[PDB]
Write an enzyme that holds these catalytic residues in place. Structure first.
Site, PDB file in Angstrom:
ATOM      1  CD  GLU A 127     -72.003  26.706 -54.338  1.00 35.07           C
ATOM      2  OE1 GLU A 127     -73.066  26.174 -54.714  1.00 35.07           O
ATOM      3  OE2 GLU A 127     -71.390  26.335 -53.322  1.00 35.07           O
ATOM      4  N   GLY A 143     -74.666   8.377 -45.491  1.00 30.54           N
ATOM      5  CA  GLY A 143     -73.945   9.122 -46.507  1.00 30.54           C
ATOM      6  C   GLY A 143     -72.856   9.925 -45.826  1.00 30.54           C
ATOM      7  CG  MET A 144     -68.982  12.942 -46.553  1.00 34.07           C
ATOM      8  SD  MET A 144     -67.869  13.448 -47.918  1.00 34.07           S
ATOM      9  CE  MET A 144     -68.938  14.553 -48.800  1.00 34.07           C
ATOM     10  CB  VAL A 145     -74.041  15.415 -45.180  1.00 37.49           C
ATOM     11  CG1 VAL A 145     -74.747  16.270 -44.139  1.00 37.49           C
ATOM     12  CG2 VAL A 145     -73.320  16.324 -46.169  1.00 37.49           C
ATOM     13  CD  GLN A 181     -81.216   8.818 -49.158  1.00 36.85           C
ATOM     14  OE1 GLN A 181     -80.888   8.383 -48.059  1.00 36.85           O
ATOM     15  NE2 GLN A 181     -80.727   8.331 -50.291  1.00 36.85           N
ATOM     16  CB  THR A 225     -83.076   4.089 -50.142  1.00 34.71           C
ATOM     17  OG1 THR A 225     -81.671   3.812 -50.190  1.00 34.71           O
ATOM     18  CG2 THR A 225     -83.285   5.515 -49.617  1.00 34.71           C
ATOM     19  CB  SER A 226     -81.074  -0.951 -48.867  1.00 35.02           C
ATOM     20  OG  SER A 226     -80.818  -2.297 -49.225  1.00 35.02           O
ATOM     21  CD  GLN A 285     -67.478  27.281 -52.961  1.00 34.00           C
ATOM     22  OE1 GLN A 285     -68.254  26.326 -52.966  1.00 34.00           O
ATOM     23  NE2 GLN A 285     -67.799  28.461 -53.472  1.00 34.00           N
ATOM     24  CG  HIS A 333     -66.143  25.804 -48.648  1.00 36.28           C
ATOM     25  ND1 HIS A 333     -65.603  24.735 -49.331  1.00 36.28           N
ATOM     26  CD2 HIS A 333     -67.482  25.737 -48.840  1.00 36.28           C
ATOM     27  CE1 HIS A 333     -66.573  24.057 -49.915  1.00 36.28           C
ATOM     28  NE2 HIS A 333     -67.724  24.644 -49.632  1.00 36.28           N
ATOM     29  CB  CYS A 352     -71.064  24.783 -47.381  1.00 36.97           C
ATOM     30  SG  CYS A 352     -70.972  24.619 -49.174  1.00 36.97           S
ATOM     31  NE  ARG A 362     -65.918  22.372 -55.601  1.00 37.83           N
ATOM     32  CZ  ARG A 362     -67.222  22.256 -55.819  1.00 37.83           C
ATOM     33  NH1 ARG A 362     -67.660  21.748 -56.961  1.00 37.83           N
ATOM     34  NH2 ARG A 362     -68.086  22.625 -54.887  1.00 37.83           N
TER      35      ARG A 362
END
Length: 357
Positions: free
Chosen positions: A229, A11-13, A60, A37-38, A149, A263, A122, A256
């Protein structure tokens, strides 16, 4: 060596985590086992396969956590669970990690036997990395916040939507912009019209972000009127600092803006006692090696204190430092930090490093 499993590493993170880990040769000091998970690499749902790991590092997500975590802990598994997702953030058997700030909290928990570590919010992480010094001296009475953000905190699709939005806005007046003699009013007229068009892509944000802003992040919390948040300012700042008994007021508004992954935060900090601005700076600057005190100078501020400058780096510049008109007790500060690094993957990478030493 320790046997560490990785989930959500694609994933991105997770990707940022993987890259930083290679950059630092983190994989040389442990035995990595990758899950997926695939159904098309082990299964992230195989409890028995996860039981064999000394440590679990997952980026995840919450659902995955809430589903697998209990079952695994249910088998008697005694290993470590390192999570980037917020699921366990507020659990009594879990600690929120930001070692350059709460190592003492991390150490003690390890002593006690804490086996679950979670990355922090974050915005709160970026704040503590910036003004940790003030907290380290017990000089912070309370802090009001206003954030700017980035989209990356929302997700990969949100970042793409921001960019697409920026594209269409310009495209709406591409020729007029090139004509040095064209009317500026006619131009904004069109940009604003496109922004409001049915076909302007706003599915992920639910509102236009490019060329605008959204003064609302996460769900509303009826009890306090804050959004989840904003609520994390008080809750998480204090859990990280281990000030569950003597909480420090941290509150404000989370907004945002059209930035990709950094940020920014404007602070109004109520200090316990009055100190010389220069002494405050030195305190701020000396807390950790990443924070960077930017002198209250225009040119330097434009070059250093911006998302443009910090994106993709581990630097945490803090600037516009000065006393506020409300009194010498009031300090003004502005900081910028990458949401994906110290606001996500970096805190995770660091705790893992410690657990495998």
């Amino acid at each position: 060596m320790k046997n560490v499993g990785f989930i959500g590493w694609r994933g991105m993170v997770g990707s940022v985590l993987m890259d930083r880990m290679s950059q630092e040769n983190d994989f040389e000091n442990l035995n990595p086992v990758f899950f997926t998970t695939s159904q098309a690499l082990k299964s992230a749902f195989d409890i028995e396969e996860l039981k064999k790991l000394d440590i679990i590092v997952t980026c995840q997500g919450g659902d995955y956590t809430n589903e697998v975590y209990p079952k695994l802990k249910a088998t008697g598994w005694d290993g470590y669970w390192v999570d980037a997702a917020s699921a366990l953030k507020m659990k009594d058997d879990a600690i929120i990690v930001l070692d350059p700030v709460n190592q003492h909290v991390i150490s003690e928990g390890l002593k006690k036997g804490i086996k679950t570590f979670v990355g922090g919010n974050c915005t709160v992480s970026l704040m503590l990395m910036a003004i940790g010094g003030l907290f380290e001296k017990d000089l912070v009475e309370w802090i009001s916040v206003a954030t700017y953000q980035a989209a990356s905190g929302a997700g990969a699709k949100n970042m793409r939507e921001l960019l697409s939005q920026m594209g269409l806005l310009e495209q709406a007046v591409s020729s007029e912009l090139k004509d040095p003699a064209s009317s500026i009013l006619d131009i904004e007229r069109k940009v604003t019209a496109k922004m409001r068009a049915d076909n302007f892509p706003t599915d992920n944000f639910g509102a236009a972000l490019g060329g605008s802003l959204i003064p609302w992040i996460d769900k509303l919390l009826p009890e306090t009127g804050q959004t989840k948040e904003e609520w994390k300012g008080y809750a998480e700042t204090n859990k990280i600092l281990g000030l569950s008994d003597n909480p420090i007021p941290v509150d404000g508004l989370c907004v945002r803006i059209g930035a990709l992954r950094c940020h920014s935060q404007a602070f109004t900090i109520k200090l316990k006692k009055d100190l010389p601005l220069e002494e405050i700076e030195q305190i701020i600057a000396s807390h950790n090696e990443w924070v960077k005190v930017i002198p209250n100078d225009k040119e330097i501020t434009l070059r250093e204190l911006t998302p443009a400058k910090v994106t993709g780096t581990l630097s945490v510049p803090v600037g516009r430092l000065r006393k506020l008109a409300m009194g010498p007790e009031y300090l003004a500060a502005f900081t910028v930090g990458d949401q994906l690094l110290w606001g996500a993957a970096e805190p995770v990478r660091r705790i893992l490093k410690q657990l495998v030493a």
